[PDB]
Every structure is written in C-alpha cells, then in structure tokens.
Amino acid sequence: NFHDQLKFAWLAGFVDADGCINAQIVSREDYLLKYQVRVSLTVFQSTTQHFILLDIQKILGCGTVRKRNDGMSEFCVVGGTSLQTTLEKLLPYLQLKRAQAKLVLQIIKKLPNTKDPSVLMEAALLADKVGLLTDGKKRTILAENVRECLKKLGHVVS
Amino acid sequence: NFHDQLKFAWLAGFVDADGCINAQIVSREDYLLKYQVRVSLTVFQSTTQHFILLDIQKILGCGTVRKRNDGMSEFCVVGGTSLQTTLEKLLPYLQLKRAQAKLVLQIIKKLPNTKDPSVLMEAALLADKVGLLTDGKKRTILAENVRECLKKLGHVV
DNA sequence: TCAAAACGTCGTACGACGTTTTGA
DNA sequence: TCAAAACGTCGTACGACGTTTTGA
Ligand SMILES: [Mg+2]
Ligand SMILES: [Mg+2]
C-alpha cells in the first residue's frame, strides 16, 4: 500500500530522468487508413545493469524488456489497455513528464474508435503535441501526412 | 512525515537515473599534503527545465544550483557535513547507486582527520573504488598519486 | 486488418571529470 | 592552509525516433 506508493514514486522519479512517454504515428501498410498512433512508456538502461529493467516490470506487472545490439537495454510498455494502467500509477508522482502522460492518456481514450478517419485524425494531432514536449528533433511523420493521405483515400476528415 | 518519504523516494529515483554520487582526488597546491578528497552528489538537467534542480534544492535544503555554459544546469552538494545529511535521506530508496553512497559515507567519516597522511591515504584508496563504479574514465589522479607525493613529502604511510 | 513484440541507430542530454574563484 | 562555490567541456549513456516480425 503505502509501500507500493514509495516504489511508484521512485519509479516516477526514474522515468522523469530516463523515461520516454511518447506518441508516434507509424505507417502500417496493411491498415485500412494506412496509419497507427502508437502510445508507449519506455525506460532506458545500459545492459551493464540490465537487472534494473526486470525490476520495473516486476513493480508494474506489464512490459517488454529487451537488449539492444548497441549495449543498451530498454523496458517498454506499448499500447492503450496496459499503458493506461501504468500511467495512472505514476501520474500523481510524475513531475517533469506529467504533460506527455496526460496527453497520452487521452490518446488512449480514442484508440478504440480509430477506425473512424476523423477520430484517427484527432488522435494524430494529439501525437504531435506530445512530440513538441520531446527533445526529439527526430520526427518525419506528422499529422499533416496522415490527413491528406486520408483525403486521398476518399475519406472526409475536415 | 511520509510525504518527504515520497519526495525522497522520487528523488532517489531521479538520482539513480541521472545523478552522480562521487568521490574525487583534486590536487590543491596550498594543501600541506597537496590533495583533497572531494565528495559530491550531483544531478543534471537541461537548462530548459532548470526549475527542477531548484525544486530538488528546496526538498533537500542544502546545495547550489548553477547554469553551465553549455545548455545544462547542475544541482550540486559538496562536502561531508551536508552530503552526509543528504545521503542518509536517499539511502533507503536508492538502488542503482546505493554502493556509491555507502563508500562516500565511509569517506566522509575520515575527512575530519584528513591532515593525517595515513588518514588521507585511506580516503584516497576509497575514492578510487567509487571510481570503479562510475561509468566514467576520465580520472587522471589515483590513490597512488597521493602516495608517491606523500612519500616524497617525507611522510610515512 | 489490426497491433504488440522485437528491433537498429543517429543525435544530444547529459555524467564525470579537471579547473578557477571566493572566502573562512 | 583549508574547502566550498562556481566553473568548462569531451565522451557516451542514453532518448526518440522509424522498421521488421510475430501473432491474434
Ligand atoms: Mg534525462
Ligand atoms: Mg542515466
């Protein structure tokens, strides 16, 4: 209880410095609408101390630990139903990344309805807003891409 | 006050991620024994988020905040009489760096008596083992480096 | 058609030093 | 003579992407 809260606070502590609460637009050519909006919480560690990623998994009950080929390890929680559960446990304690969290929670809100081209569209717009709160000067794929390729598929968003 | 306990736990989580609990040999020419064992806790964030180091400072009640000329800011806690106070706060919640706290606390126990060459000498050997726990490889001054020099000052160890 | 599991890597936010200044 | 306050900067542990694979 109060014990579980101290681990969530420590974990929030850790995510705030090494975490990554994100929302990307991934192209998926088998999709009807060509795009998926991926939600994820990822925590990075050197494989030297890979043991730490299994601990977080334990504490959270969800997530995928891998070794990367460059000497790093990632622990990662992908997707709405499980990521939502993890965020509500961290949210009260997150400080630096409560915005990325709170936005992503409301992306999860709409993910069950993303077959609708305009629901998918508000989701992607929200993914951009998350990307501005991230020192990722990395993103090639934005909502504007989704929207007009949506337009090309004959769909009417706005 | 279990709220502090929540804040300390959060902090320990941060320190474990982007912190630095360390012990260093710095050459100081105006010292008799020419060497200080400097102990420190340090936390980094980009200056874009400079406010979080000031919060950290508020939680602990010790420590200096500075902007660096490079885009980053640091929160730093140097010296035994205020770094012991802080480490005993984290120590129950630290994970990744609990080893460096303990070693550094064992260093701090000796600093009061660091004029004594053998006492300095042992603090020196201790700092090197805090060095074998830091992904770092920058250090150019080793517990040896206190010894030739102590030797050459005509001291016995 | 969906979507997570698992993946590979470039760029920079950092870690970890040594250095210079203040002042007790 | 001590020693913190304050400093400057290179290397690498990370972040934040996009991509392939598995599988429902
Ligand atoms: Mg960070
Ligand atoms: Mg780290």
Side-chain angles (χ1 to χ4, degrees):
Chain A
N1 190 341
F2 295 4
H3 195 65
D4 255 354
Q5 299 179 352
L6 282 172
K7 290 285 229 152
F8 288 142
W10 173 92
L11 180 54
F14 204 79
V15 165
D16 261 337
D18 279 341
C20 180
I21 299 178
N22 206 13
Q24 349 186 10
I25 298 157
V26 308
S27 73
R28 297 305 304 186
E29 272 143 68
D30 29 19
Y31 271 48
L32 228 51
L33 309 171
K34 297 296 167 186
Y35 291 100
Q36 185 212 356
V37 163
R38 180 182 301 163
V39 301
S40 46
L41 184 156
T42 282
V43 156
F44 302 96
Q45 222 50 62
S46 162
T47 306
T48 47
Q49 302 188 22
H50 176 107
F51 75 90
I52 205 98
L53 296 165
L54 308 163
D55 282 2
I56 294 172
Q57 172 195 269
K58 185 72 162 298
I59 297 178
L60 287 185
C62 266
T64 271
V65 183
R66 66 158 164 149
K67 312 204 186 195
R68 288 161 43 163
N69 70 352
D70 63 5
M72 290 298 290
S73 298
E74 301 185 356
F75 159 92
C76 169
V77 198
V78 203
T81 67
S82 44
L83 175 54
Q84 176 189 356
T85 299
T86 295
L87 283 190
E88 333 199 318
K89 288 178 303 236
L90 296 187
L91 222 41
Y93 310 105
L94 279 181
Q95 239 77 29
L96 294 180
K97 304 203 153 101
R98 202 190 302 168
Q100 290 99 306
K102 208 82 190 186
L103 285 183
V104 155
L105 261 94
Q106 276 179 4
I107 305 196
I108 292 169
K109 231 137 194 46
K110 325 183 144 40
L111 291 190
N113 296 134
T114 41
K115 277 158 23 208
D116 188 319
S118 63
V119 165
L120 179 56
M121 190 68 223
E122 293 177 350
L125 292 171
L126 278 179
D128 293 346
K129 222 127 199 48
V130 180
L132 303 158
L133 325 181
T134 92
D135 304 320
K137 261 195 241 158
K138 282 174 178 173
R139 242 182 247 226
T140 75
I141 189 124
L142 317 140
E144 138 183 354
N145 294 129
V146 165
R147 120 171 182 76
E148 263 220 49
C149 166
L150 265 187
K151 234 144 196 190
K152 283 170 192 54
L153 294 164
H155 299 95
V156 172
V157 166
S158 289
Chain B
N1 171 119
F2 183 75
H3 174 288
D4 295 61
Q5 294 326 317
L6 287 170
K7 225 115 233 196
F8 288 166
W10 175 88
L11 191 46
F14 207 82
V15 165
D16 264 341
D18 299 353
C20 195
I21 307 187
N22 198 344
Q24 203 170 149
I25 325 299
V26 310
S27 50
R28 300 237 116 225
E29 245 204 347
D30 48 332
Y31 277 43
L32 280 213
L33 313 174
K34 302 298 173 169
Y35 293 104
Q36 180 197 9
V37 170
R38 168 183 295 149
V39 293
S40 50
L41 163 74
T42 300
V43 173
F44 314 85
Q45 266 292 5
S46 213
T47 313
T48 61
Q49 293 177 335
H50 169 103
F51 72 90
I52 194 77
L53 305 185
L54 290 176
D55 292 346
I56 283 180
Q57 169 194 276
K58 175 63 191 317
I59 289 181
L60 291 180
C62 286
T64 72
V65 169
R66 64 134 172 165
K67 308 189 173 195
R68 289 165 32 162
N69 71 328
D70 101 295
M72 311 280 328
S73 313
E74 299 193 352
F75 164 82
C76 189
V77 177
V78 206
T81 299
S82 64
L83 175 55
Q84 175 187 22
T85 291
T86 295
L87 290 185
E88 281 172 326
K89 267 142 169 183
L90 310 182
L91 262 197
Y93 310 117
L94 295 174
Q95 297 293 314
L96 288 188
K97 290 160 200 278
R98 193 185 299 170
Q100 292 131 286
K102 287 279 171 159
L103 286 200
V104 161
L105 288 188
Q106 291 292 126
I107 298 198
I108 293 187
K109 264 154 45 169
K110 297 177 157 42
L111 294 178
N113 320 323
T114 196
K115 300 169 182 298
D116 175 350
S118 60
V119 170
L120 173 59
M121 184 62 221
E122 293 177 350
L125 298 157
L126 271 193
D128 289 345
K129 283 183 74 172
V130 191
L132 307 174
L133 311 190
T134 57
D135 315 318
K137 289 179 179 179
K138 293 179 179 179
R139 65 154 115 278
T140 289
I141 281 128
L142 298 253
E144 61 180 62
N145 293 124
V146 170
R147 134 172 293 136
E148 293 177 350
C149 184
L150 281 181
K151 233 98 166 283
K152 188 206 156 207
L153 282 146
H155 295 293
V156 181
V157 187

PDB file of all heavy atoms in Angstrom, chain A residues 99-132:
ATOM      1  N   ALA A  99       2.879  16.000 -18.478  1.00  0.00           N
ATOM      2  CA  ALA A  99       2.194  16.516 -19.664  1.00  0.00           C
ATOM      3  C   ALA A  99       2.140  15.465 -20.771  1.00  0.00           C
ATOM      4  O   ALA A  99       1.078  15.201 -21.361  1.00  0.00           O
ATOM      5  CB  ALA A  99       2.874  17.749 -20.160  1.00  0.00           C
ATOM      6  N   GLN A 100       3.295  14.866 -21.047  1.00  0.00           N
ATOM      7  CA  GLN A 100       3.377  13.772 -22.003  1.00  0.00           C
ATOM      8  C   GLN A 100       2.444  12.655 -21.574  1.00  0.00           C
ATOM      9  O   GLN A 100       1.809  12.009 -22.404  1.00  0.00           O
ATOM     10  CB  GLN A 100       4.807  13.260 -22.116  1.00  0.00           C
ATOM     11  CG  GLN A 100       5.767  14.205 -22.787  1.00  0.00           C
ATOM     12  CD  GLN A 100       6.599  14.987 -21.791  1.00  0.00           C
ATOM     13  OE1 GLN A 100       6.071  15.649 -20.886  1.00  0.00           O
ATOM     14  NE2 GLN A 100       7.917  14.907 -21.942  1.00  0.00           N
ATOM     15  N   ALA A 101       2.344  12.457 -20.266  1.00  0.00           N
ATOM     16  CA  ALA A 101       1.495  11.409 -19.723  1.00  0.00           C
ATOM     17  C   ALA A 101       0.050  11.746 -19.969  1.00  0.00           C
ATOM     18  O   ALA A 101      -0.687  10.954 -20.545  1.00  0.00           O
ATOM     19  CB  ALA A 101       1.744  11.223 -18.238  1.00  0.00           C
ATOM     20  N   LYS A 102      -0.347  12.937 -19.541  1.00  0.00           N
ATOM     21  CA  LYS A 102      -1.746  13.314 -19.547  1.00  0.00           C
ATOM     22  C   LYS A 102      -2.288  13.378 -20.969  1.00  0.00           C
ATOM     23  O   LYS A 102      -3.429  12.996 -21.216  1.00  0.00           O
ATOM     24  CB  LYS A 102      -1.938  14.644 -18.825  1.00  0.00           C
ATOM     25  CG  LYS A 102      -3.310  14.781 -18.193  1.00  0.00           C
ATOM     26  CD  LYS A 102      -3.419  14.092 -16.837  1.00  0.00           C
ATOM     27  CE  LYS A 102      -4.876  14.030 -16.355  1.00  0.00           C
ATOM     28  NZ  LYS A 102      -5.016  13.483 -14.961  1.00  0.00           N
ATOM     29  N   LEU A 103      -1.464  13.837 -21.908  1.00  0.00           N
ATOM     30  CA  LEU A 103      -1.874  13.868 -23.308  1.00  0.00           C
ATOM     31  C   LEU A 103      -2.098  12.449 -23.822  1.00  0.00           C
ATOM     32  O   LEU A 103      -3.150  12.145 -24.400  1.00  0.00           O
ATOM     33  CB  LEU A 103      -0.835  14.594 -24.165  1.00  0.00           C
ATOM     34  CG  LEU A 103      -0.822  16.125 -24.016  1.00  0.00           C
ATOM     35  CD1 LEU A 103       0.178  16.779 -24.960  1.00  0.00           C
ATOM     36  CD2 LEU A 103      -2.207  16.708 -24.233  1.00  0.00           C
ATOM     37  N   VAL A 104      -1.110  11.583 -23.586  1.00  0.00           N
ATOM     38  CA  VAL A 104      -1.164  10.185 -23.997  1.00  0.00           C
ATOM     39  C   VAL A 104      -2.370   9.448 -23.401  1.00  0.00           C
ATOM     40  O   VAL A 104      -2.940   8.576 -24.054  1.00  0.00           O
ATOM     41  CB  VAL A 104       0.162   9.447 -23.619  1.00  0.00           C
ATOM     42  CG1 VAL A 104      -0.051   7.948 -23.456  1.00  0.00           C
ATOM     43  CG2 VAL A 104       1.242   9.724 -24.662  1.00  0.00           C
ATOM     44  N   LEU A 105      -2.778   9.793 -22.180  1.00  0.00           N
ATOM     45  CA  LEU A 105      -3.947   9.136 -21.600  1.00  0.00           C
ATOM     46  C   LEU A 105      -5.179   9.403 -22.455  1.00  0.00           C
ATOM     47  O   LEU A 105      -6.048   8.526 -22.624  1.00  0.00           O
ATOM     48  CB  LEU A 105      -4.217   9.594 -20.167  1.00  0.00           C
ATOM     49  CG  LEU A 105      -3.748   8.712 -19.004  1.00  0.00           C
ATOM     50  CD1 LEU A 105      -2.380   9.131 -18.515  1.00  0.00           C
ATOM     51  CD2 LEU A 105      -4.754   8.747 -17.863  1.00  0.00           C
ATOM     52  N   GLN A 106      -5.258  10.612 -23.005  1.00  0.00           N
ATOM     53  CA  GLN A 106      -6.409  10.957 -23.808  1.00  0.00           C
ATOM     54  C   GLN A 106      -6.255  10.595 -25.274  1.00  0.00           C
ATOM     55  O   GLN A 106      -7.226  10.674 -26.035  1.00  0.00           O
ATOM     56  CB  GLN A 106      -6.723  12.433 -23.641  1.00  0.00           C
ATOM     57  CG  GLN A 106      -7.550  12.625 -22.403  1.00  0.00           C
ATOM     58  CD  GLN A 106      -7.861  14.035 -22.161  1.00  0.00           C
ATOM     59  OE1 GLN A 106      -7.511  14.891 -22.964  1.00  0.00           O
ATOM     60  NE2 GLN A 106      -8.516  14.314 -21.042  1.00  0.00           N
ATOM     61  N   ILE A 107      -5.053  10.180 -25.673  1.00  0.00           N
ATOM     62  CA  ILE A 107      -4.937   9.463 -26.937  1.00  0.00           C
ATOM     63  C   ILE A 107      -5.526   8.075 -26.747  1.00  0.00           C
ATOM     64  O   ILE A 107      -6.151   7.523 -27.651  1.00  0.00           O
ATOM     65  CB  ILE A 107      -3.491   9.326 -27.438  1.00  0.00           C
ATOM     66  CG1 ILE A 107      -2.810  10.694 -27.549  1.00  0.00           C
ATOM     67  CG2 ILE A 107      -3.474   8.622 -28.792  1.00  0.00           C
ATOM     68  CD1 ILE A 107      -1.529  10.674 -28.393  1.00  0.00           C
ATOM     69  N   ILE A 108      -5.323   7.504 -25.566  1.00  0.00           N
ATOM     70  CA  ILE A 108      -5.795   6.149 -25.318  1.00  0.00           C
ATOM     71  C   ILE A 108      -7.318   6.169 -25.316  1.00  0.00           C
ATOM     72  O   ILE A 108      -7.971   5.202 -25.732  1.00  0.00           O
ATOM     73  CB  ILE A 108      -5.251   5.574 -23.995  1.00  0.00           C
ATOM     74  CG1 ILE A 108      -3.738   5.336 -24.099  1.00  0.00           C
ATOM     75  CG2 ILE A 108      -5.950   4.265 -23.627  1.00  0.00           C
ATOM     76  CD1 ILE A 108      -3.067   5.010 -22.765  1.00  0.00           C
ATOM     77  N   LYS A 109      -7.869   7.290 -24.867  1.00  0.00           N
ATOM     78  CA  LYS A 109      -9.311   7.495 -24.846  1.00  0.00           C
ATOM     79  C   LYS A 109      -9.958   7.111 -26.187  1.00  0.00           C
ATOM     80  O   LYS A 109     -10.945   6.363 -26.232  1.00  0.00           O
ATOM     81  CB  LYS A 109      -9.627   8.956 -24.511  1.00  0.00           C
ATOM     82  CG  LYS A 109     -10.630   9.122 -23.393  1.00  0.00           C
ATOM     83  CD  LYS A 109     -10.213  10.219 -22.423  1.00  0.00           C
ATOM     84  CE  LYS A 109     -11.027  10.133 -21.142  1.00  0.00           C
ATOM     85  NZ  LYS A 109     -11.101   8.712 -20.659  1.00  0.00           N
ATOM     86  N   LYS A 110      -9.345   7.587 -27.266  1.00  0.00           N
ATOM     87  CA  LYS A 110      -9.897   7.483 -28.603  1.00  0.00           C
ATOM     88  C   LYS A 110      -9.427   6.284 -29.432  1.00  0.00           C
ATOM     89  O   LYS A 110     -10.031   5.992 -30.474  1.00  0.00           O
ATOM     90  CB  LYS A 110      -9.587   8.768 -29.357  1.00  0.00           C
ATOM     91  CG  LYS A 110      -9.629   9.961 -28.441  1.00  0.00           C
ATOM     92  CD  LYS A 110      -9.412  11.282 -29.140  1.00  0.00           C
ATOM     93  CE  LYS A 110     -10.305  12.282 -28.454  1.00  0.00           C
ATOM     94  NZ  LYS A 110     -10.258  12.014 -26.972  1.00  0.00           N
ATOM     95  N   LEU A 111      -8.380   5.592 -28.979  1.00  0.00           N
ATOM     96  CA  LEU A 111      -7.808   4.473 -29.740  1.00  0.00           C
ATOM     97  C   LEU A 111      -8.814   3.348 -30.056  1.00  0.00           C
ATOM     98  O   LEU A 111      -8.755   2.766 -31.139  1.00  0.00           O
ATOM     99  CB  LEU A 111      -6.591   3.868 -29.010  1.00  0.00           C
ATOM    100  CG  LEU A 111      -5.270   4.642 -28.878  1.00  0.00           C
ATOM    101  CD1 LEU A 111      -4.193   3.723 -28.342  1.00  0.00           C
ATOM    102  CD2 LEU A 111      -4.823   5.261 -30.194  1.00  0.00           C
ATOM    103  N   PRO A 112      -9.713   3.007 -29.111  1.00  0.00           N
ATOM    104  CA  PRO A 112     -10.740   2.038 -29.510  1.00  0.00           C
ATOM    105  C   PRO A 112     -11.628   2.489 -30.688  1.00  0.00           C
ATOM    106  O   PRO A 112     -12.216   1.632 -31.363  1.00  0.00           O
ATOM    107  CB  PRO A 112     -11.563   1.877 -28.231  1.00  0.00           C
ATOM    108  CG  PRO A 112     -10.541   2.057 -27.132  1.00  0.00           C
ATOM    109  CD  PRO A 112      -9.618   3.129 -27.641  1.00  0.00           C
ATOM    110  N   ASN A 113     -11.709   3.790 -30.954  1.00  0.00           N
ATOM    111  CA  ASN A 113     -12.534   4.266 -32.060  1.00  0.00           C
ATOM    112  C   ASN A 113     -11.766   4.733 -33.305  1.00  0.00           C
ATOM    113  O   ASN A 113     -12.319   5.477 -34.113  1.00  0.00           O
ATOM    114  CB  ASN A 113     -13.442   5.416 -31.590  1.00  0.00           C
ATOM    115  CG  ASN A 113     -14.444   4.983 -30.524  1.00  0.00           C
ATOM    116  OD1 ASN A 113     -14.619   5.669 -29.513  1.00  0.00           O
ATOM    117  ND2 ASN A 113     -15.105   3.838 -30.744  1.00  0.00           N
ATOM    118  N   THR A 114     -10.519   4.301 -33.488  1.00  0.00           N
ATOM    119  CA  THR A 114      -9.690   4.888 -34.554  1.00  0.00           C
ATOM    120  C   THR A 114      -9.946   4.349 -35.970  1.00  0.00           C
ATOM    121  O   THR A 114      -9.220   4.684 -36.907  1.00  0.00           O
ATOM    122  CB  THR A 114      -8.177   4.726 -34.258  1.00  0.00           C
ATOM    123  OG1 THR A 114      -7.918   3.429 -33.714  1.00  0.00           O
ATOM    124  CG2 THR A 114      -7.741   5.754 -33.261  1.00  0.00           C
ATOM    125  N   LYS A 115     -10.969   3.525 -36.137  1.00  0.00           N
ATOM    126  CA  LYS A 115     -11.376   3.114 -37.476  1.00  0.00           C
ATOM    127  C   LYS A 115     -11.996   4.306 -38.207  1.00  0.00           C
ATOM    128  O   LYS A 115     -11.822   4.478 -39.413  1.00  0.00           O
ATOM    129  CB  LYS A 115     -12.368   1.968 -37.406  1.00  0.00           C
ATOM    130  CG  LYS A 115     -11.754   0.590 -37.239  1.00  0.00           C
ATOM    131  CD  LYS A 115     -12.805  -0.338 -36.646  1.00  0.00           C
ATOM    132  CE  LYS A 115     -14.218   0.203 -36.933  1.00  0.00           C
ATOM    133  NZ  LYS A 115     -15.225  -0.189 -35.912  1.00  0.00           N
ATOM    134  N   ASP A 116     -12.744   5.111 -37.460  1.00  0.00           N
ATOM    135  CA  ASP A 116     -13.220   6.421 -37.910  1.00  0.00           C
ATOM    136  C   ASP A 116     -12.040   7.320 -38.304  1.00  0.00           C
ATOM    137  O   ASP A 116     -11.223   7.657 -37.463  1.00  0.00           O
ATOM    138  CB  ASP A 116     -14.045   7.070 -36.785  1.00  0.00           C
ATOM    139  CG  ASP A 116     -14.742   8.356 -37.208  1.00  0.00           C
ATOM    140  OD1 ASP A 116     -14.146   9.192 -37.929  1.00  0.00           O
ATOM    141  OD2 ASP A 116     -15.892   8.561 -36.764  1.00  0.00           O
ATOM    142  N   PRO A 117     -11.966   7.732 -39.579  1.00  0.00           N
ATOM    143  CA  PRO A 117     -10.911   8.602 -40.116  1.00  0.00           C
ATOM    144  C   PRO A 117     -10.789   9.970 -39.430  1.00  0.00           C
ATOM    145  O   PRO A 117      -9.724  10.586 -39.514  1.00  0.00           O
ATOM    146  CB  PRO A 117     -11.321   8.794 -41.576  1.00  0.00           C
ATOM    147  CG  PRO A 117     -12.180   7.653 -41.878  1.00  0.00           C
ATOM    148  CD  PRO A 117     -12.927   7.358 -40.619  1.00  0.00           C
ATOM    149  N   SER A 118     -11.835  10.449 -38.768  1.00  0.00           N
ATOM    150  CA  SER A 118     -11.716  11.737 -38.087  1.00  0.00           C
ATOM    151  C   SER A 118     -11.384  11.524 -36.611  1.00  0.00           C
ATOM    152  O   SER A 118     -10.860  12.426 -35.940  1.00  0.00           O
ATOM    153  CB  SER A 118     -12.989  12.578 -38.260  1.00  0.00           C
ATOM    154  OG  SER A 118     -14.114  11.949 -37.680  1.00  0.00           O
ATOM    155  N   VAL A 119     -11.661  10.327 -36.101  1.00  0.00           N
ATOM    156  CA  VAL A 119     -11.191  10.001 -34.760  1.00  0.00           C
ATOM    157  C   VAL A 119      -9.695   9.738 -34.821  1.00  0.00           C
ATOM    158  O   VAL A 119      -8.946  10.210 -33.972  1.00  0.00           O
ATOM    159  CB  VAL A 119     -11.916   8.789 -34.157  1.00  0.00           C
ATOM    160  CG1 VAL A 119     -11.147   8.257 -32.929  1.00  0.00           C
ATOM    161  CG2 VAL A 119     -13.350   9.166 -33.795  1.00  0.00           C
ATOM    162  N   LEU A 120      -9.263   9.003 -35.841  1.00  0.00           N
ATOM    163  CA  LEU A 120      -7.842   8.758 -36.049  1.00  0.00           C
ATOM    164  C   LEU A 120      -7.125  10.096 -36.182  1.00  0.00           C
ATOM    165  O   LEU A 120      -5.980  10.266 -35.730  1.00  0.00           O
ATOM    166  CB  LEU A 120      -7.602   7.909 -37.298  1.00  0.00           C
ATOM    167  CG  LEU A 120      -6.114   7.656 -37.555  1.00  0.00           C
ATOM    168  CD1 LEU A 120      -5.496   7.025 -36.330  1.00  0.00           C
ATOM    169  CD2 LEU A 120      -5.865   6.805 -38.769  1.00  0.00           C
ATOM    170  N   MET A 121      -7.829  11.046 -36.794  1.00  0.00           N
ATOM    171  CA  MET A 121      -7.281  12.360 -37.082  1.00  0.00           C
ATOM    172  C   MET A 121      -7.062  13.212 -35.839  1.00  0.00           C
ATOM    173  O   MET A 121      -6.045  13.898 -35.746  1.00  0.00           O
ATOM    174  CB  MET A 121      -8.184  13.117 -38.042  1.00  0.00           C
ATOM    175  CG  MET A 121      -7.531  14.374 -38.553  1.00  0.00           C
ATOM    176  SD  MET A 121      -6.142  14.006 -39.629  1.00  0.00           S
ATOM    177  CE  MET A 121      -4.968  15.217 -39.009  1.00  0.00           C
ATOM    178  N   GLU A 122      -7.995  13.194 -34.891  1.00  0.00           N
ATOM    179  CA  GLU A 122      -7.751  13.926 -33.657  1.00  0.00           C
ATOM    180  C   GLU A 122      -6.657  13.226 -32.837  1.00  0.00           C
ATOM    181  O   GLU A 122      -5.908  13.874 -32.111  1.00  0.00           O
ATOM    182  CB  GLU A 122      -9.032  14.109 -32.833  1.00  0.00           C
ATOM    183  CG  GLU A 122     -10.088  14.994 -33.426  1.00  0.00           C
ATOM    184  CD  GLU A 122     -11.353  15.053 -32.564  1.00  0.00           C
ATOM    185  OE1 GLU A 122     -11.455  14.253 -31.613  1.00  0.00           O
ATOM    186  OE2 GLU A 122     -12.226  15.919 -32.803  1.00  0.00           O
ATOM    187  N   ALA A 123      -6.538  11.909 -32.986  1.00  0.00           N
ATOM    188  CA  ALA A 123      -5.501  11.176 -32.280  1.00  0.00           C
ATOM    189  C   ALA A 123      -4.117  11.597 -32.779  1.00  0.00           C
ATOM    190  O   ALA A 123      -3.219  11.891 -31.976  1.00  0.00           O
ATOM    191  CB  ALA A 123      -5.701   9.677 -32.442  1.00  0.00           C
ATOM    192  N   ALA A 124      -3.950  11.633 -34.100  1.00  0.00           N
ATOM    193  CA  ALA A 124      -2.671  12.019 -34.684  1.00  0.00           C
ATOM    194  C   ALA A 124      -2.283  13.458 -34.293  1.00  0.00           C
ATOM    195  O   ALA A 124      -1.125  13.708 -33.949  1.00  0.00           O
ATOM    196  CB  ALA A 124      -2.705  11.867 -36.193  1.00  0.00           C
ATOM    197  N   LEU A 125      -3.239  14.389 -34.333  1.00  0.00           N
ATOM    198  CA  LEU A 125      -2.975  15.767 -33.894  1.00  0.00           C
ATOM    199  C   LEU A 125      -2.429  15.804 -32.465  1.00  0.00           C
ATOM    200  O   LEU A 125      -1.520  16.566 -32.154  1.00  0.00           O
ATOM    201  CB  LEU A 125      -4.242  16.631 -33.998  1.00  0.00           C
ATOM    202  CG  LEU A 125      -4.688  16.885 -35.442  1.00  0.00           C
ATOM    203  CD1 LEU A 125      -6.086  17.554 -35.563  1.00  0.00           C
ATOM    204  CD2 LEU A 125      -3.609  17.701 -36.149  1.00  0.00           C
ATOM    205  N   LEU A 126      -2.991  14.965 -31.604  1.00  0.00           N
ATOM    206  CA  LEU A 126      -2.532  14.859 -30.233  1.00  0.00           C
ATOM    207  C   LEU A 126      -1.122  14.266 -30.170  1.00  0.00           C
ATOM    208  O   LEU A 126      -0.365  14.579 -29.260  1.00  0.00           O
ATOM    209  CB  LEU A 126      -3.505  14.011 -29.409  1.00  0.00           C
ATOM    210  CG  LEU A 126      -4.747  14.731 -28.885  1.00  0.00           C
ATOM    211  CD1 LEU A 126      -5.633  13.762 -28.115  1.00  0.00           C
ATOM    212  CD2 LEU A 126      -4.358  15.926 -28.012  1.00  0.00           C
ATOM    213  N   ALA A 127      -0.770  13.424 -31.138  1.00  0.00           N
ATOM    214  CA  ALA A 127       0.558  12.814 -31.158  1.00  0.00           C
ATOM    215  C   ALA A 127       1.650  13.852 -31.426  1.00  0.00           C
ATOM    216  O   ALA A 127       2.808  13.674 -31.027  1.00  0.00           O
ATOM    217  CB  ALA A 127       0.624  11.707 -32.192  1.00  0.00           C
ATOM    218  N   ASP A 128       1.267  14.932 -32.096  1.00  0.00           N
ATOM    219  CA  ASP A 128       2.195  15.982 -32.467  1.00  0.00           C
ATOM    220  C   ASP A 128       2.505  16.851 -31.284  1.00  0.00           C
ATOM    221  O   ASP A 128       3.642  17.282 -31.106  1.00  0.00           O
ATOM    222  CB  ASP A 128       1.618  16.831 -33.578  1.00  0.00           C
ATOM    223  CG  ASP A 128       1.487  16.079 -34.866  1.00  0.00           C
ATOM    224  OD1 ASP A 128       2.078  14.969 -34.987  1.00  0.00           O
ATOM    225  OD2 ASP A 128       0.791  16.621 -35.761  1.00  0.00           O
ATOM    226  N   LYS A 129       1.512  16.997 -30.457  1.00  0.00           N
ATOM    227  CA  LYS A 129       1.630  17.836 -29.330  1.00  0.00           C
ATOM    228  C   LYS A 129       2.555  17.217 -28.336  1.00  0.00           C
ATOM    229  O   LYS A 129       3.263  17.928 -27.664  1.00  0.00           O
ATOM    230  CB  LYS A 129       0.278  18.010 -28.722  1.00  0.00           C
ATOM    231  CG  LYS A 129       0.017  19.405 -28.292  1.00  0.00           C
ATOM    232  CD  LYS A 129      -1.264  19.880 -28.888  1.00  0.00           C
ATOM    233  CE  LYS A 129      -1.322  21.369 -28.869  1.00  0.00           C
ATOM    234  NZ  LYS A 129      -0.055  21.895 -29.400  1.00  0.00           N
ATOM    235  N   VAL A 130       2.516  15.889 -28.229  1.00  0.00           N
ATOM    236  CA  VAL A 130       3.445  15.127 -27.424  1.00  0.00           C
ATOM    237  C   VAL A 130       4.838  15.298 -28.012  1.00  0.00           C
ATOM    238  O   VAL A 130       5.802  15.510 -27.276  1.00  0.00           O
ATOM    239  CB  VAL A 130       3.085  13.645 -27.351  1.00  0.00           C
ATOM    240  CG1 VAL A 130       4.114  12.904 -26.492  1.00  0.00           C
ATOM    241  CG2 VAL A 130       1.687  13.476 -26.778  1.00  0.00           C
ATOM    242  N   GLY A 131       4.956  15.257 -29.302  1.00  0.00           N
ATOM    243  CA  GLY A 131       6.260  15.378 -29.883  1.00  0.00           C
ATOM    244  C   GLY A 131       6.943  16.719 -29.722  1.00  0.00           C
ATOM    245  O   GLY A 131       8.120  16.835 -29.986  1.00  0.00           O
ATOM    246  N   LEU A 132       6.198  17.729 -29.327  1.00  0.00           N
ATOM    247  CA  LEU A 132       6.786  19.028 -29.143  1.00  0.00           C
ATOM    248  C   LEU A 132       7.351  19.078 -27.740  1.00  0.00           C
ATOM    249  O   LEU A 132       8.331  19.735 -27.512  1.00  0.00           O
ATOM    250  CB  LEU A 132       5.796  20.176 -29.415  1.00  0.00           C
ATOM    251  CG  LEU A 132       5.104  20.244 -30.780  1.00  0.00           C
ATOM    252  CD1 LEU A 132       3.837  21.037 -30.712  1.00  0.00           C
ATOM    253  CD2 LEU A 132       5.985  20.780 -31.866  1.00  0.00           C
TER     254      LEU A 132
END
